[PDB]
Amino acid sequence: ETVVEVPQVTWEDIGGLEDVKRELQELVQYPVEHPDKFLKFGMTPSKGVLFYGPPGCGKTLLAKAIANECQANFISIKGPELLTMWFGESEANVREIFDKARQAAPCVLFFDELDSIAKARGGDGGGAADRVINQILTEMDGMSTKKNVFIIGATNRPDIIDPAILRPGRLDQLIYIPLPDEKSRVAILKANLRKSPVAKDVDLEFLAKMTNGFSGADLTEICQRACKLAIRESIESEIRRERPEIRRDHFEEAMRFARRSVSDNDIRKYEMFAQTLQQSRGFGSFRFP
Amino acid sequence: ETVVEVPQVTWEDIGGLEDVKRELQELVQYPVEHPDKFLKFGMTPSKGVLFYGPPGCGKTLLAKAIANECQANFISIKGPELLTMWFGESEANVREIFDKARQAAPCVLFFDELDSIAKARGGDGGGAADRVINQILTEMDGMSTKKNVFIIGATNRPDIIDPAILRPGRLDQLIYIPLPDEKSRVAILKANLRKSPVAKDVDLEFLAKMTNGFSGADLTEICQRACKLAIRESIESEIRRERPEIRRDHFEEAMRFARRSVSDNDIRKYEMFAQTLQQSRGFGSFRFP
Amino acid sequence: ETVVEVPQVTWEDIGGLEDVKRELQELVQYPVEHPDKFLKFGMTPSKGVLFYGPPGCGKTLLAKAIANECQANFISIKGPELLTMWFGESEANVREIFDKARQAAPCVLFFDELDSIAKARGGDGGGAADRVINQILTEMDGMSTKKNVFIIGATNRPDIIDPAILRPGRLDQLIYIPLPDEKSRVAILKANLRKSPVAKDVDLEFLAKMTNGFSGADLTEICQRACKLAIRESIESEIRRERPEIRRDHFEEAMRFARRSVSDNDIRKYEMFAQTLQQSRGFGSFRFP
Amino acid sequence: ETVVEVPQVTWEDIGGLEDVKRELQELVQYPVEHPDKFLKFGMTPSKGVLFYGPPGCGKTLLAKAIANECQANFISIKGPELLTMWFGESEANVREIFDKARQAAPCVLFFDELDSIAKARGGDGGGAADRVINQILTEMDGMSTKKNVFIIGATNRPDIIDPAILRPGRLDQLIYIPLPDEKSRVAILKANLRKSPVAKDVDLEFLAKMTNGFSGADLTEICQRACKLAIRESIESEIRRERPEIRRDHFEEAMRFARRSVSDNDIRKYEMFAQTLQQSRGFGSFRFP
Amino acid sequence: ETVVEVPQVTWEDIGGLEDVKRELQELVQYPVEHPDKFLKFGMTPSKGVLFYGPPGCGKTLLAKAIANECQANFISIKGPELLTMWFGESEANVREIFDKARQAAPCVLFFDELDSIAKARGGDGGGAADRVINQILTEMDGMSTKKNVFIIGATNRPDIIDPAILRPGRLDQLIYIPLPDEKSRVAILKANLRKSPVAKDVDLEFLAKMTNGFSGADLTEICQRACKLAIRESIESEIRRERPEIRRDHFEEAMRFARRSVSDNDIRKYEMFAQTLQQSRGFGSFRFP
Amino acid sequence: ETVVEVPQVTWEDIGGLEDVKRELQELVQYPVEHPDKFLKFGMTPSKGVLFYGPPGCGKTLLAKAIANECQANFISIKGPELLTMWFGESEANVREIFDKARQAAPCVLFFDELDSIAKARGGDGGGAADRVINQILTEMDGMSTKKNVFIIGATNRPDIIDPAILRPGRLDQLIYIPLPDEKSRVAILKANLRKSPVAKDVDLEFLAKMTNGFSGADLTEICQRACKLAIRESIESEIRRERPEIRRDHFEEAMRFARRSVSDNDIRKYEMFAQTLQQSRGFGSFRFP
Numbered sequence A, B, C, D, E, F: 001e002t003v004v005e006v007p008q009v010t011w012e013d014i015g016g017l018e019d020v021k022r023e024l025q026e027l028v029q030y031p032v033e034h035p036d037k038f039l040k041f042g043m044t045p046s047k048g049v050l051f052y053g054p055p056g057c058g059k060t061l062l063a064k065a066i067a068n069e070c071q072a073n074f075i076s077i078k079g080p081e082l083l084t085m086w087f088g089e090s091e092a093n094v095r096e097i098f099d100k101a102r103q104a105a106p107c108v109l110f111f112d113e114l115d116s117i118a119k120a121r122g123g124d125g126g127g128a129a130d131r132v133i134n135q136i137l138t139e140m141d142g143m144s145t146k147k148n149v150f151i152i153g154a155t156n157r158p159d160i161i162d163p164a165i166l167r168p169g170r171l172d173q174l175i176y177i178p179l180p181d182e183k184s185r186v187a188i189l190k191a192n193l194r195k196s197p198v199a200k201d202v203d204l205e206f207l208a209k210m211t212n213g214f215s216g217a218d219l220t221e222i223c224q225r226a227c228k229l230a231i232r233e234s235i236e237s238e239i240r241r242e243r244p245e246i247r248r249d250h251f252e253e254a255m256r257f258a259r260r261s262v263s264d265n266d267i268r269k270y271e272m273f274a275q276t277l278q279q280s281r282g283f284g285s286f287r288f289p
């Protein structure tokens, strides 16, 4: 059944994304800490956020990190659960999920892969409205701002999402999670090697330089392959008999199996989407007399 | 469950739309106040209306304002509820809604996003008749004019709505809610700032001049962004420690993130629809001997 | 529930259509009055009729007028009732309707908008047979001619109607209800003003001359708009305070909002249908030696 | 419910079709009368027949006449009943129909409009097998030849009919019912006037000459129109007051409204089908030494 | 209900197909008679077969003949039974059929028209797997080779049958049942005339010569037509009154109504299929040193 | 019901595929034997594998061999069972299968023909997600790494499987099972002849040389055909009466009926798939300073 706890991952685990960290802090921490200011200015705190970007870039990690920092319970609803709700034609369970989230406030309700249903039906003879997202947004409208329940959605295909969600009262802001850069990749590599002992001759900077287009999942996979090679070598040596830490050789061997999950076309499309939004922004020249 | 009350908004809240205000008054207030004249002329009061226009222009606000002025209960039926009835194949709940509206007369029954079902199926292998609008118009026909129940519909896509609703006995009139003009935008900005204190140096007229194509929702969003910026600045200042009213700088900053929800093509299409209806009117030359 | 009564309308209410009046009389009155002649000649009385023509021309009025003249109960089955029988997949209620009609003989069963189901499915992957018309014609075949139950159908789209109905045993004839002419328009205007007092200076002939392509519903709407304008003016004058009959000014104002419901293309198509039937008639030259 | 009785019609009622009369006699009469010959030759009597031709030519009349001649019960299953069984998804009732036919042997089971289901599906995404014809042919296979139950099918579209029925064990032969010829038309007109007294000056031969392409239904309709005109004239004369047999004038008037149900293209297609079968026959030259 | 017995037909009834007779003997007789050899060589006996060819060539007859020769029960399953199991969505009855076959071992289970479901779907939006053939495969895999249950399938369209059936463990071999040749046609005619007495003057060889492309069903139909003509002539002679064996003249007359069930294109396609398989065989040159 | 046992087949039974054997050993045997190393390095053992290649190359044999070597229970789920779960809309039985696998750890769960559902729907109006694979991967995510349950999947069409399975947490690695080479073919032939006695003069090398493109199933079929020919010859000799080991003649005869299941186009496509993955690998040059 559902698991409700305080995620262990902290801010240090996530490398880079300083602006997104600051913005998420502003959105989540401030309303609970200082409601007096919001009352004074009569502004209604934002209800939720929507992360969109290429897969394996740090969305679920960001949600867990903010939940841990706020010290609030975290409820995760993966895509297969949504698809099970759709196929079984039993959409009445969303009410139960929302009630469970309400019971354990403060909380952050994370709807992973919010686009799964849209993809499953083509990405489709019908329109853009399905029988699960309808219930989700109905319950979202029906909730009370008195409770500190924060809804976060994550997708890697922000062009088939039902537009009704992005209305001002349900999920206003859109945050873009880009591919890591050189400094970001160095930070990612540093973060992931805190658990696996590594020889000191390894140069993380050089490794980060050579992997230009890479998602975080790819760097994690590289680390796992290096660890697996080391384990295999150690076990073979133990088997040798009569008849401990990763070195550079294992990383060199592992890099041959590295691959780029996201093709250049997908990144180009994502930057096109971001540029479209930033162009629709407009109003670069403005000032009172 | 459903909420039945007297909406709080009033006429002074809504900016502009003087002609629509007068026409709605004529449609709603007059029948109840002076039934003697209608009896003398033997006229049957109009049963409902249908607002059509681009999203975020002030339809729900107009319905609430007229309900408040008439001092009558207001029942809102949003689009997600209609879609829930369609998906669940349980269209027999419309009878319950109409019974509830009848029980609390005088009342105005507001059907928001009356075209949602049509969009959900493409906008579609079948025809223009669905299984929910059928029940709605059946109940509408089966009602008694003795009661003071007024049906108001809204929609931002008045070209896929089922033509059967627009028959003389169900929803005769069609009102057009255009985008605000310069004076309308100034009034809108004045109305929305009655809650958030603002520095006197702000020039609302200049701000309204520079936003040519804008819906009311966009101006509200601009105000909200300015308020959020002010709250963030105050929070940062308080956090600074040792180691109250919005100014012009916050509006200048917020304007950079402003956006136009409705594209030019949509406004062109709506103007084309209005001009098509007006051309269909015709008969500009008429005078008895 | 259903309403079974004697319609209050009368032949005078309907303007024009003298030929159709005479033919409907010949079809309905003669069978009941003088069954002896039919027995002598061994001819079976015709069972039903099918009106077809542009909307708002006087079909329901014709049915009600004939029912009133025969002094027989009138049962109306609107289009939405058929559509809800189709959507709910409960077509067994047609037996109940026919039994109710049989119980209260003599009666005329009026199936309004008999083509609604065909339109609802496109006008369509399948063929021309649905699950409601099937039951209707089964019951129609299964009834006894000794009873005086008369089935009258109406439709404004006599090209998607299932051909099985038009077989000799079910619905023999096809009457055409054309748009009113100048004399017909004058009569229509005279009929509708029997209840609204009107100043003597109004010239109905001139008004009828200037409305070339119109339907009865449009003329009724013109009258309603004039009455609404008069009521508004009277109420405003009463409101003036310190601080009864229609005139030509009100009609002049109302005519600006007049419109033609049916486009020229539809009239052309209907005329082509009628001419196709009259060409299929043929046999102009014929005489025995 | 179902009606099981001996049809009243006789051979004299049907005009023409001598060859088909002889064939039907040879098919049904001989098996029951002289089973000894069939036993001696060890031949299995043919089980059923299939009538195919343009509508309204005398298929049901042929079935009724042969049933009356054999003095056997006649069970009729119209098209609407088959369509009702298809729509309701309850095809298990065919077993009951066949059992009822068995209980009343000798009998002829007449499946009117055997192609209705195929037409209702388009004439269609699926194949040529439906859920009712399957049960019909299953029961046909499961019947005992000892009983004298004769299955006769009719249809006016012998190209969408499921080919499985025409296999040797189910429905062997395919009789063709053509449009009446001049002598056939004269006989048809003579047959239908046995009930309506007619002035002796009427020349049936001349009337039949001038109707080149006509079906029996059209001639019956002409007679009915003449009778209706005479009835109307007599009713008017009786109404005259102070203030018996059809003459030629009534036929002259009725001829104006005559029509041809079957177009030339349909007759061309039917003749094409018959000639295709005849060409497939072949083997015109054959003789032993 | 189902019938389980030992078919009466024997080898001498079927004409020609000597090679197929020998191969079926090798497939069926040898496993039961001499299991010792199979145990010694450690080879698993083949489980089933699949006949494919144009309709009416002697597939069912071959199955019945092998069943009779082996003196084992024969369970037949026609296409309509499979189709009704598909339409009713009750595929769980296949388990009962297989259990019944197991109960009466040794037996041969004959699935007639194994492609009926595929044809009924078009020959189709979906793939090549249906809901009944799946159950057949499951039961076939779940069977025990200890029992002597032999599965034989037939089909006259071996290009839409689900490819999963032809896997090594389910139905390995395929046999082609060609159209009879001249000698085969002579044998077929001889076999079918063992019942109807025939005058010695008839020359079967000449009749077989003149029918180049015919199927067995056509020859049976020719014999039946000749017998029917003889019966009709005898009946007429007996009816004549005052006021035994088929001759050549009856065959001469019956030949006129003979027809070819299978068109040349179908035989060309079947020959193409056989040639494709034989080309895929290959390996005509092979020998060890 | 399901059968759970230790498969009999061993490594010796399978010919060739040395690299695949070593990799499967590394994946399965190592985690259970030396968990201390994995704990020390903090690496999480891989959960499953996914074989892909042309049919009949030895995927099931590899799974059974690894299960036997690890001495762990083996549970097989064939394609027909998955299709049965899909058609019946009863996908809740996957929980039962996974529970059964958990109960008997250590075990290897083998989902044979994992793509069957995708093929059955075209390979399709909808997307890439079905109602059974969803439950499978949900349960796979919900499993505990503490138990030694190893999910192995097989599929001979790795271009339509749902991409969600190939995510890092569900089924990480993809292994290619290519067509046997000359040495592999010789080994395959040697393995399959351990049960059927064969004359010493047979030259397996020469036989393997002449079959360039052949799957293992084809070689097994050749052996089976040779055995069948030998059995038939022995049976005939025994039948001869008055009135033991396979030789080269039987193989020479059997070669005539040999065939190639996989066309060259399929091998080309599979090679292109492998080359695409190996190109996506990239990173041929890498070395720290």
Ligand SMILES: Nc1ncnc2c1ncn2[C@@H]1O[C@H](COP(=O)(O)OP(=O)(O)O)[C@@H](O)[C@H]1O
Pocket: A013, A014, A015, A016, A054, A055, A056, A057, A058, A059, A060, A061, A188, A191, A192, A215, A216, A217, A220
């Ligand atoms: N910024 C990051 N810092 C460290 N690890 C990261 C980062 N982004 C992604 N990862 C790696 O990716 C994995 C989680 O991916 P996730 O963010 O859930 O993908 P998605 O956003 O598609 O859900 C973790 O195992 C983590 O190691």
Ligand SMILES: Nc1ncnc2c1ncn2[C@@H]1O[C@H](COP(=O)(O)OP(=O)(O)O)[C@@H](O)[C@H]1O
Pocket: B013, B014, B015, B016, B054, B055, B056, B057, B058, B059, B060, B061, B188, B191, B192, B215, B216, B217, B220
């Ligand atoms: N004429 C107006 N005056 C003031 N505010 C307006 C006006 N029109 C729209 N708004 C703003 O729009 C919001 C309501 O939008 P609404 O009218 O419900 O959109 P829609 O018409 O699409 O339902 C309010 O928060 C309000 O601030």
Ligand SMILES: Nc1ncnc2c1ncn2[C@@H]1O[C@H](COP(=O)(O)OP(=O)(O)O)[C@@H](O)[C@H]1O
Pocket: C013, C014, C015, C016, C054, C055, C056, C057, C058, C059, C060, C061, C188, C191, C192, C215, C216, C217, C220
């Ligand atoms: N011949 C007519 N005379 C008077 N009024 C008419 C006539 N035809 C239509 N009307 C007007 O039309 C209305 C009824 O229309 P109806 O005949 O029901 O349209 P439809 O035939 O499409 O159902 C009435 O209110 C009536 O005033």
Ligand SMILES: Nc1ncnc2c1ncn2[C@@H]1O[C@H](COP(=O)(O)OP(=O)(O)O)[C@@H](O)[C@H]1O
Pocket: D013, D014, D015, D016, D054, D055, D056, D057, D058, D059, D060, D061, D188, D191, D192, D215, D216, D217, D220
């Ligand atoms: N050969 C005929 N002789 C007399 N009347 C005929 C003949 N053929 C058709 N009719 C007329 O047609 C009507 C019945 O038509 P029917 O045979 O049922 O058409 P269908 O064969 O399409 O069912 C009868 O009223 C009958 O008067």
Ligand SMILES: Nc1ncnc2c1ncn2[C@@H]1O[C@H](COP(=O)(O)OP(=O)(O)O)[C@@H](O)[C@H]1O
Pocket: E013, E014, E015, E016, E054, E055, E056, E057, E058, E059, E060, E061, E188, E191, E192, E215, E216, E217, E220
């Ligand atoms: N080789 C044959 N010898 C004798 N009769 C045959 C032969 N082939 C077909 N027939 C005739 O065909 C009929 C059976 O046809 P069948 O083989 O069942 O067709 P299908 O193969 O389509 O099932 C029998 O009545 C039989 O007289």
Ligand SMILES: Nc1ncnc2c1ncn2[C@@H]1O[C@H](COP(=O)(O)OP(=O)(O)O)[C@@H](O)[C@H]1O
Pocket: F013, F014, F015, F016, F054, F055, F056, F057, F058, F059, F060, F061, F156, F188, F191, F192, F215, F216, F217, F220
């Ligand atoms: N490497 C191999 N060595 C020996 N036999 C093999 C080999 N590969 C396939 N086979 C043969 O193929 C059959 C099993 O095929 P299988 O591996 O189940 O095909 P698939 O992988 O399509 O399921 C066995 O009977 C076996 O004799």
Ligand SMILES: CCSc1ccccc1NC(=O)C[C@@H](C)N1Cc2ccccc2C1=O
Pocket: A156, A157, A158, A159, A266, A269, A270, A272, A273
């Ligand atoms: C926002 C990135 S969308 C995307 C991302 C990864 C993988 C696939 C997709 N979608 C597509 O490829 C469909 C095609 C038609 N795109 C292209 C595109 C560029 C900019 C804007 C909108 C669209 C759109 O609808």
Ligand SMILES: CCSc1ccccc1NC(=O)C[C@@H](C)N1Cc2ccccc2C1=O
Pocket: B156, B157, B158, B159, B266, B269, B270, B272, B273
């Ligand atoms: C009445 C505005 S309709 C509209 C408005 C916003 C967003 C979308 C839409 N519809 C469409 O874009 C579909 C296309 C085909 N339009 C265009 C159009 C102009 C005038 C009249 C009728 C139509 C119509 O059916």
Ligand SMILES: CCSc1ccccc1NC(=O)C[C@@H](C)N1Cc2ccccc2C1=O
Pocket: C156, C157, C158, C159, C266, C269, C270, C272, C273
């Ligand atoms: C009998 C008028 S039918 C009609 C009337 C109003 C509004 C629409 C329609 N139908 C159509 O427009 C569809 C088009 C394809 N028409 C045209 C037409 C002329 C004559 C005969 C038959 C057809 C037909 O099927």
Ligand SMILES: CCSc1ccccc1NC(=O)C[C@@H](C)N1Cc2ccccc2C1=O
Pocket: D156, D157, D158, D159, D266, D269, D270, D272, D273
């Ligand atoms: C046996 C005539 S069936 C028919 C009868 C009346 C009205 C319509 C129809 N069918 C059609 O018009 C469909 C078209 C495609 N036809 C024409 C045709 C001629 C000869 C052979 C077969 C076909 C066939 O399938």
Ligand SMILES: CCSc1ccccc1NC(=O)C[C@@H](C)N1Cc2ccccc2C1=O
Pocket: E156, E157, E158, E159, E266, E269, E270, E272, E273
């Ligand atoms: C094996 C004979 S299949 C057949 C037999 C009778 C009646 C109809 C059919 N099928 C078809 O006509 C469909 C068309 C597309 N054919 C032709 C063909 C020749 C060779 C190989 C395969 C195919 C195939 O799929």
Ligand SMILES: CCSc1ccccc1NC(=O)C[C@@H](C)N1Cc2ccccc2C1=O
Pocket: F156, F157, F158, F159, F266, F269, F270, F272, F273
């Ligand atoms: C991975 C080979 S999949 C395959 C194997 C055997 C038999 C058939 C198939 N699929 C197909 O033939 C469909 C066609 C459209 N292919 C070709 C192809 C080559 C490489 C990559 C992807 C594709 C793809 O989608």
